[PDB]
Amino acid sequence: MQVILLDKVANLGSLGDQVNVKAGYARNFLVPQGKAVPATKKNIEFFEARRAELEAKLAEVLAAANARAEKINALETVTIASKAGDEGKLFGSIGTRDIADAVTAAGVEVAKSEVRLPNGVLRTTGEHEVSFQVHSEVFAKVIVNVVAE
Amino acid sequence: MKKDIHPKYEEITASCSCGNVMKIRSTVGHDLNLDVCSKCHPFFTGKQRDVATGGRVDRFNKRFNIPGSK
RNA sequence: UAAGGUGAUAUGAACCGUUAUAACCGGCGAUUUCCGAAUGGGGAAACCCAGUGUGUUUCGACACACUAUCAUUAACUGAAUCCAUAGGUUAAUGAGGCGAACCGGGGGAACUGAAACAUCUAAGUACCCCGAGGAAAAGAAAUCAACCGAGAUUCCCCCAG
RNA sequence: UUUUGUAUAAUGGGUCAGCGACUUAUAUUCUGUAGCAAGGUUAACCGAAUAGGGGAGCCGAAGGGAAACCGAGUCUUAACUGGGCGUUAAGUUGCAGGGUAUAGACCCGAAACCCGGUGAUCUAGCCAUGGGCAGGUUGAAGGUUGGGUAACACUAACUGGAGGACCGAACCGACUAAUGUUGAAAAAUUAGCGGAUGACUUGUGGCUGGGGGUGAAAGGCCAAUCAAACCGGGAGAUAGCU
RNA sequence: GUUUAUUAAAAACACAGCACUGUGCAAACACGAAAGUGGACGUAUACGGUGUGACGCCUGCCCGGUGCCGGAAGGUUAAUU
RNA sequence: UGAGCCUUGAUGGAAGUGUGGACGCCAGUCUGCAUGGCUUUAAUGUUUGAUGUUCUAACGUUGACCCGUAAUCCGGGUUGCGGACAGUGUCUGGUGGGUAGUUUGACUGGGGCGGUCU
RNA sequence: GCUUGACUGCGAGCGUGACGGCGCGAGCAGGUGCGAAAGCAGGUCAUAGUGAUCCGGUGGUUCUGAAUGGAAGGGCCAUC
Ligand SMILES: [Mg+2]
Ligand SMILES: [Mg+2]
Ligand SMILES: [Mg+2]
Ligand SMILES: [Mg+2]
Ligand SMILES: [Mg+2]
Ligand SMILES: [Mg+2]
Ligand SMILES: [Mg+2]
Ligand SMILES: [Mg+2]
Ligand SMILES: [Mg+2]
Ligand SMILES: [Mg+2]
Ligand SMILES: [Mg+2]
Ligand SMILES: [Mg+2]
Ligand SMILES: [Mg+2]
Ligand SMILES: [Mg+2]
Ligand SMILES: [Mg+2]
Ligand SMILES: [Mg+2]
Ligand SMILES: [Mg+2]
Ligand SMILES: [Mg+2]
Ligand SMILES: [Mg+2]
Ligand SMILES: [Mg+2]
Ligand SMILES: [Mg+2]
Ligand SMILES: [Mg+2]
Ligand SMILES: [Mg+2]
């Protein structure tokens, strides 16, 4: 009554039940050819290097993609004009590119897949709020300002 | 007779009734086979109960690491 | 070691020896047909038949020599199925069978007694089977003791009929 | 010898010579005898071996009570009485003997039970492969032809050749009588008798093993042995019997 | 036709025929601790067991008892928990 | 389909017209549903016992085919059929002259039958 | 009529048995009933109405209780 499937199969367990399981059922089916399981010490802990190394992301991996709002906040005033004209309007398009690409001042690069703005940005020019939407675990903030030319 | 893993028995014994019967008992154990070894592939050892229950706590290898060498 | 000596039932014949290789005794060897675990195959035991090698060779023959079965290991080969195994060959080791008792172990009676007979006894005896030694077996406390202590096993005398 | 009782015509012995039955071990208890004495005595073992050493231990000098316990007393009972058992009985250790105990237990003897082997060269079945059956008789099925039927059945002859068929040698078997009965013979001889192409008979070899086999069945046969073979063993079974 | 080899050859055993009953094949059944073998290289017109014993005319009544076959609702009931 | 824990239920968003199940001392209330302005006891979760369904994957195969192999054995493999059955081990109720070990008294004008054993 | 002597603990000394055992019994101790009292009562007029041992069951008792305290179990007494 102790096994470690990890490859759930209609059984009341997934990722390998570490608690009381079925018995005699694996002796000739589950274990053989199916999914070996012997939840006996040795085999048990051996699942750690397979699972205990997935949650470490909340510290290790996150740290490599969480400092977003930190890495980019005091950012140089993004001065990417959007063609200010039309007796008080504009011509430039404000959406994804101009917003994300508004960082390659020195040369850095990003992607237009992390943005937080439900409504499409109005074609104004004022302090364009750009709350970077990298991961759900971490957010950030950016700005954009249109100019005349 | 077999039960390989563990010894066996087949040891005699007098079966009494009400007071006594100078008879005899003996043949015991079980049998079965076809044990899929995670390694290459299954040979059918003729173990029995207690013998089969042994391959549990143990392995399927150690339990054979004897029937082989030794 | 030695003057005698060639085993015995009977000499006898033909002989060997007396100084130190005649005997005779002891040690190490050489040889040692056929059967018999018998082992090349077979077989009503001391017989029958073959394969592959040898030299002497008028160079056909001769006899000789090796060829059983298992187990361990080594190498080479190797199916259904890529693989890998199963299997096959070879070779080096080793075993095999006898053996009086004691010894360990597996199996295990009945007559008999109980003044009958089932429990019980005879007795784990008889016997059968396997194994090993020169002895075997057992053996350094999950022993005993009783608030004191002893201190592996084994065998002897008491405890006790 | 056995019996109330035997010359008994009840048992045993032809005779002689040799052999033939109360032993032995340890334990226990008496008797005699010896040693020592309220003490006697060691066992194994050591050994300068029958010494000497060794007193572990056994027995006796205290008993009563189921016992705790008490103690020349003690149980009994509520009893301090009486009553039961004890209390100025010398034991102990050898040696020899009487008896007993455990043993084969004075000696001889069963019918049997159990264990392990040897036996199907006899015999009972069965398997494989070979052999035998002089002679004479009857004469089925089938068929040919004539007849006959619309066609068949039916029929008559001739051919044909069957059959656990007939008679009868070999061969196989045994119903009767005589003889034999210390035989010629541990089942036969003589004169008859039954089967004799069949569930037949026979040579050679093989296969069934003892509580087992085989059996046209008698408990028959399984090597002159069978309501459980022969050989060895448990075994000196047991024998309130002779 | 067979039988008590060695006191019984028969009215006894066998027999062909009949009946009951079991067996679906890895058959029932038997030998065997088992493997395996016979049954049978057969397969229900087959094989086994029991009784009767050519053939002819037949084979009556009883299922209370015992045995066997079916049912199995209810009562009693083992190990086991 | 029972039974355990116990989870939601009936005793101990705002009126009116109705429907179903509840039960009766009965003349009745309970209880879900439109428009309208703790235990007595049920359901789902489950735990475990029952029968019955189906599956494959232990297990069987005296079916076929492939090798070992110019085998009827055996083993491995593929495949088919059967299937947690069958069958085996331990335990347990039957039945059990198939077999085995035994018992089945004595007195007595022989013994037996009858009768009697204090 | 009144009652529980169909009592408890012992028993001089006898009778009868191979033995196991069986029977008779005055008297003594503690407490009873009946009688005013002497006294009588330890079952029925007497003689048949019975079963040894083992294995246990029930109640009582600090008899014992395997290191010790308990306990189980054993003894003892009563009884089935
Ligand atoms: Mg040879
Ligand atoms: Mg040979
Ligand atoms: Mg006796
Ligand atoms: Mg007389
Ligand atoms: Mg005379
Ligand atoms: Mg004489
Ligand atoms: Mg006195
Ligand atoms: Mg004839
Ligand atoms: Mg004649
Ligand atoms: Mg004739
Ligand atoms: Mg012959
Ligand atoms: Mg004979
Ligand atoms: Mg004897
Ligand atoms: Mg004798
Ligand atoms: Mg005749
Ligand atoms: Mg005769
Ligand atoms: Mg005759
Ligand atoms: Mg008849
Ligand atoms: Mg009739
Ligand atoms: Mg009998
Ligand atoms: Mg007997
Ligand atoms: Mg008599
Ligand atoms: Mg009277």
Contacts of A46 by beta carbon, 8 Å cutoff, 6+ apart: none
Strand partners, B64: none
What's the gap between Cα A35 and its chain centre?
Answer: 32
Sort B25 into a burial class: Cβ within 10 Å, 0-12 / 13-18 / 19+.
exposed
What's the gap between Cα A106 and its chain centre?
Answer: 26
The vertex-B68 CA angle with B64 and B70, nearest 5°, equals 115
**CATH code of the domain in which A131 resides:** 3.10.430.100
Nearest C-alpha neighbor of A101 from the set A89, A117, A113, A90: A113
Q: How far is the CA of B13 from the C1' of D101 (A)?
A: 37
- Full residue range of the structural domain in which residue A95 is found: 69-148
Q: How far is the CA of B68 from the centre of ligand 7 (A)?
A: 88
Residues in chain B closer than 8 A to A32 (CB atoms): 36, 38, 42
DSSP helix/strand/coil, A28: helix
**Residue A132 · residue A142 · CB < 8 Å:** yes
**Would you list which residues of B are annotated within the binding site for Zn(2+)?**
16
**Residue A83 · residue A91 · CB < 8 Å:** yes
Angstrom distance (rounded) from CA B61 to CA A66: 48
Instruction: Give me the phi and psi of B34, to 5 degrees please.
Output: 60, 70
Exposed e or buried b per residue across B38-56, where buried means at least 16 C-beta atoms within 10 angstroms of its C-beta: eeeeeeebebbeebbebbe
Which method, experimentally, gave rise to this model? X-ray
**Residue A84 · residue A148 · CB < 8 Å:** yes
User: How do the residues of chain B divide into helix, strand and coil, expressed in percent and rounded to 5?
Assistant: 5, 5, 90
What's the gap between Cα A22 and its chain centre?
Answer: 37
**Alpha helices per DSSP H over A42-120:** 42-45, 48-51, 60-63, 68-71, 97-100
A32 touches chain B (CB under 8 A): yes
Angstrom distance (rounded) from CA A71 to CA A101: 16
8-state DSSP, A64: T
Give this entry's resolution in angstroms. Answer: 3.5
How many CB atoms are closer than 10 A to CB A128? 21
Maximal CA-CA distance, chain B: 56
8-state DSSP, A10: S
Cβ contact B36–A33 (<8 Å): yes
Angstrom distance (rounded) from CA A94 to CA A109: 18
Nearest C-alpha neighbor of A43 from the set A23, A22, A16: A16
A77 touches chain B (CB under 8 A): no
The vertex-A41 CA angle with A37 and A45, nearest 5°, equals 85
Angstrom distance (rounded) from CA A55 to CA A45: 16
